[PDB]
Amino acid sequence: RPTFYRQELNKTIWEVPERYQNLSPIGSGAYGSVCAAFDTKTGLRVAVKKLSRPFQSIIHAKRTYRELRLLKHMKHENVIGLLDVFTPARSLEEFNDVYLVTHLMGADLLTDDHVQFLIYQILRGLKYIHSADIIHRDLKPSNLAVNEDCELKILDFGLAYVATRWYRAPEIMLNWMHYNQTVDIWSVGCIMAELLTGRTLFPGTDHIDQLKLILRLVGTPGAELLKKISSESARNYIQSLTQMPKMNFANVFIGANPLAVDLLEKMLVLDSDKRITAAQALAHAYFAQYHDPDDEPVADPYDQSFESRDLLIDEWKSLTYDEVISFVPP
Ligand SMILES: Nc1c(C(=O)c2cccc(OC[C@@H](O)CO)c2)cnn1-c1ccc(F)cc1
């Protein structure tokens, strides 16, 4: 066990191991605050998220457990992974704080070769994630941390402007049909289109407007898709709206690489059974310059049985401590 040091930066208190020096506060969030930090052991710059209020409620307790379990499991070039996890607490009883340490990236979310590399990496990262039955579910430019090699990593959570709903698959925002992993692909689509044009594709001012903007482009659900809407409420809503034709995506993404536009038509379909998977998306002609199937690996199986559990603050708290204790750096 290493020795720690204390620090107040931005009204929040920080208790890290000496091995992490020069804490620079660089971003904040709903579930915590990230500091930049130099790691004396590896000689690398790293990020440190101190989870804010990790064990305040059953919802916080579970969430904290969830975050740790996922980062511990993520091992991939395009997905943010745990370099170190620690706590100033010397026992489970005192255990009140959780710090997560990962790589320092650079920034967030240009030429068609850039879009290609960036989107390639996101989709290489969603192939993996998706392979372990995980769905990012809130994929957006600010969970996409790039450095100057242009090298991408998917963040579990971003930093703090961009509305989440600007990037949500209709299905999982209007709760309107059975959803699958391909909710992230809708987002990648929305992200990809932004990189190409410079403009948010679906810059909606709320749920109803968002749906208006998506339908402008993609067209109202036809009889084959209306068929799969499970909500009495939403079928009503859709069918009542004034009917819109589907657009030619070349007329909307003009001068964009025709292969880029083909990938877009393939990602931005309402019918989540038709939508292109990550694994499929990589084999698209658009990525010819980077696609390599012997190097788009899948992930170890991931036990999310815990998601279906109702436990007590203290129990979750204990499982998390377990995961701190059971860590091994790479
Ligand atoms: N690794 C990162 C970053 C970054 O590296 C990052 C992201 C965007 C911008 C950014 O700025 C870097 C420079 O401005 C400061 O050196 C860093 C932001 N959050 N996280 C993160 C940390 C610990 C976790 F457990 C989970 C996620």
Ligand 1 atom at shortest distance from the alpha carbon of 101:
23
Query: At what resolution in Å was this solved?
Result: 2.8
- Closest residue by Cα to atom 11, ligand 1, is 106
Report CA(112)–ligand 1 centroid distance (Å): 26
> Please, what is the end-to-end C-alpha distance for the chain in angstroms?
18
CA dihedral 136, 139, 143, 144 (to 10 degrees): 110
CB-based contact 298:278 (threshold 8 Å) = no
In the chain, where does DSSP find H-type helix?
58-73, 112-131, 183-197, 207-218, 223-226, 232-240, 258-267, 278-282, 313-325
Same domain as 125, residue 212: yes
Verify that 213 and 96 share a domain, yes or no: no
35 CA → ligand 1 middle, Å = 8
Residue 284: CATH number of its domain: 1.10.510.10
| Elucidated via | X-ray
Note down the domain range covering 288. 107-298
Q: Which two tokens stand for residue 66?
A: 């969830």
**Ligand 1: centre distance to CA 104 (Å):** 5
* 3 state SS of 254: coil
Q: Are residues 67 and 39 in the same domain?
A: yes
32 and 116 together in one domain:
no
Q: How far apart are CA 105 and CA 121, in angstroms?
A: 15
Do 100 and 231 lie in one domain? The reply is no
**Could you tell me which of 111, 116, 163 has the C-alpha nearest to residue 141?**
163
Residues 94 and 163 in one domain: no
Residues flanking ligand 1, CB < 6 Å: 26-27, 34, 36, 47, 49, 71, 80, 100, 102-108, 145, 155-156, 159
Q: Ligand 1 centroid vs 142 CA: distance in angstroms?
A: 10
Tokens 């190409």 belong to 196
Ligand 1 mutation pick, 35, 104, 151, max ligand atoms within 8 A of CB: 104
Tokens of 171: 């299905």
Mutate which of 23, 35, 39, 49 for ligand 1? The one with the most ligand atoms within 8 Å of its CB, which is 49
Sequential DSSP letters for 224-243: HHHTT---HHHHHHHHHSPP
Same domain for 210 and 285, yes or no, is: yes
Identity of the amino acid at 132: A
User: What is the C-alpha to C-alpha distance for residues 320 and 65, in angstroms, rounded to an integer?
Assistant: 5
| Same domain assignment for residues 140 and 175 | yes
Half-sphere exposure of 227 (CA within 13 A, CB side): 7
- Number of folded domains in the chain? 2
Residues 279 and 158 in one domain: yes
Cα 128 to averaged position of ligand 1 atoms, centre (Å): 21
Cα Rg of the chain, angstroms? 21
Question: For a substitution probing ligand 1, which of 159, 320, 324, 327 has the most ligand atoms within 8 Å of its CB?
Answer: 159
Question: Nearest 5 degrees, angle CA 253-CA 255-CA 257?
Answer: 85
Give the CATH number of the domain where residue 58 resides: 3.30.200.20
Alpha-carbon gap, residue 95 to 30, rounded angstroms = 21
Q: Are 270 and 249 in contact (CB under 8 A)?
A: no
Distance (Å) of CA 95 to CA 11, 57, 98, 190? 21, 15, 8, 41
The 10 Å CB-count burial string (b at 16+, else e) for 194-223 is: bbbeeebbbebeeeeebbbbbbebbbbbee
Structure token pair of residue 284? 């698209």
| Tokens encoding 158 | 């971003």
| 10 secondary structure, DSSP code | S
- Which residues are registered as beta bridge partners of 76? 79
Catalytic residues: 156
> Which ligand 1 atom is the nearest neighbour of the CA of 26?
15
Contacts of 238-244 with CB under 8 Å at 24 or more apart are: 241/212, 241/215, 244/215, 244/216, 244/219, 244/220
User: Are 95 and 240 within one domain?
Assistant: no
Contacts of 206 (CB under 8 A, 6+ apart): 165
**Within this chain, do residues 304 and 223 fall inside the same structural domain, yes or no?**
no
38 and 87 belong to one structural domain = yes
Taking the CA atoms of 227, 229, 232 and 237 in sequence, report the sign of the dihedral they define: negative
